[PDB]
Design a protein around this ligand. Structure first.
Ligand SMILES: C[C@H]1C[C@](Cc2nc(Nc3nccs3)cc3ccccc23)(C(=O)O)CCN1Cc1cccc(Cl)c1F
Ligand SMILES: C[C@H]1C[C@](Cc2nc(Nc3nccs3)cc3ccccc23)(C(=O)O)CCN1Cc1cccc(Cl)c1F
Lengths: 253, 253
């Protein structure tokens, strides 16, 4: 794989880490997206190890609701990621356009997200927080997790370590349950549940789990969102509980 | 401060990070220990930031049961730490020499440790795991914590973070309560409570908190050790509870 194998189109975002472009593989004429990351930028920020781990994880993820990584390559200064192109843009842009989503559209997206996350959980892969600007849309309107936000000793010290230092990240697998609650609310309401005018007030609202619903949010949607937005991570439902929630099964396409 | 200000004596340990030596300040003839760390070694291991934070914390710690950092200095390639010299060596060496400690010696050391840790807790400083080889002894037999094992955002992301990602390290302040339990047991018994022939068996014993006491360990010592060695960090006592435990108040000098 080399840069010359691709015809480049319009930019699809610019950042300090990498630029993304629409591209076409020259031989096949297959449309895709090419992300170019600069090695020195990744090294200077101490994110190069984190990137390699996320790319290795992402290589084995094949799901309709996860943005596909077709392959990758590099040269002396840059790493190139060959990605699926999602033609309908972000869920964030769609929410801006529509103001808020109806219950069918929302339950469908939540199902797609929980399916992707359940598929990853079965491979012992968990995801961190999820933002709607990192959720892309395919030609048939399928949502695509596109952030790559995945995660999978000193001598003579084991004897002295407590269980929490050796058992690993205990309930880090529950961060994405809280993200589904925030997204389900944001999709129905048009804004995230803890949004406030200042950092301190936003922090207070999340830490105390202080949120209310507009009157139009229905009983089923409130029940699901209230179960997802638990302060204690272990009390948040399993993804299989989300997929079988009656508001989800009634409204999801 | 410069190297020429000190007369160097015998080595007090050698490692890939730094060498320690007995030293005497030339003008005052005051005995101390000088630790020399190589900047390139610290940088290559990605421990240089961690070191600066621990040294900054350690600069403000003045307690008879914490090894004193008198000051520090550097040149082009190395960082020098000017430390208190503890003439009676480690608690680890004393335990080897005596086989095990009596209840008075043990309760006294536990008190000294809990006092140091309580003093740090009041300054919002917590400690990680504690090993007896990092516990030194002063001329009057006072134990000295000497490991420096102390500890004190993306745009548009706060709205999407769960409480556990913003509230910080929740109960990391409880690791050192588990260390006091392991040390109290090791001091009375002569070996740590979860010691086993293999890594897998040691891991199993800590994770399941599977330990027993030799018949000679008394009721009071069992009560304290059993309260410290709780799997759930939040259920371990506060340091003030350790200091007021009747086995401690009865046996501590
Ligand atoms: C900064 C924005 C630019 C972006 C451009 C854009 N992309 C597509 N489809 C793609 N399929 C693959 C990659 S982009 C379709 C578009 C349709 C109309 C308008 C802009 C479009 C947008 O404005 O929606 C995409 C989202 N982020 C970047 C970004 C964020 C996370 C991950 C990735 Cl990989 C990423 F690129
Ligand atoms: C590898 C061993 C070597 C050591 C040497 C030694 N030190 C002292 N007293 C000191 N007061 C200040 C620093 S050393 C007294 C001794 C008495 C007899 C025999 C050896 C002695 C030992 O064998 O006990 C000390 C413990 N660790 C090193 C070590 C570990 C953690 C922190 C530090 Cl700073 C450190 F140096």
């Amino acid at each position: 794989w080399a840069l010359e194998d691709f015809e480049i189109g319009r930019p699809l975002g610019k950042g300090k880490f990498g630029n993304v472009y629409l591209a076409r593989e020259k031989q096949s004429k297959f449309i895709l997206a090419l992300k170019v990351l600069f090695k020195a930028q990744l090294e200077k920020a101490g994110v190069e190890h984190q990137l390699r781990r996320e790319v290795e994880i992402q290589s084995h993820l094949r799901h309709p609701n996860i943005l596909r990584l077709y392959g990758y390559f590099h040269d002396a200064t840059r790493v190139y990621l060959i990605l699926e192109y999602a033609p309908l843009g972000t869920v964030y842009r769609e929410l801006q356009k529509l103001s808020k989503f109806d219950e069918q559209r929302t339950a469908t997206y939540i199902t797609e997200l929980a399916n992707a996350l359940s598929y990853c959980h079965s491979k012992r892969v968990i995801h961190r927080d999820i933002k709607p600007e990192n959720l892309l849309l395919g030609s048939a309107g399928e949502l695509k997790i596109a952030d790559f936000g995945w995660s999978v000793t000193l001598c003579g010290t084991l004897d002295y370590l407590p269980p929490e230092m050796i058992e690993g990240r205990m309930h880090d697998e529950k961060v994405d349950l809280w993200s589904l609650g925030v997204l389900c609310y944001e999709f129905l309401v048009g804004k995230p549940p803890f949004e406030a005018n200042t950092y301190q007030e936003t922090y207070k609202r999340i830490s105390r789990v202080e949120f209310t619903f507009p009157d139009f949010v229905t009983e089923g949607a409130r029940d699901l969102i209230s179960r997802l937005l638990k302060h204690n991570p272990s009390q948040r439902p399993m993804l299989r509980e989300v997929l079988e929630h009656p508001w989800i099964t009634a409204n999801s396409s």
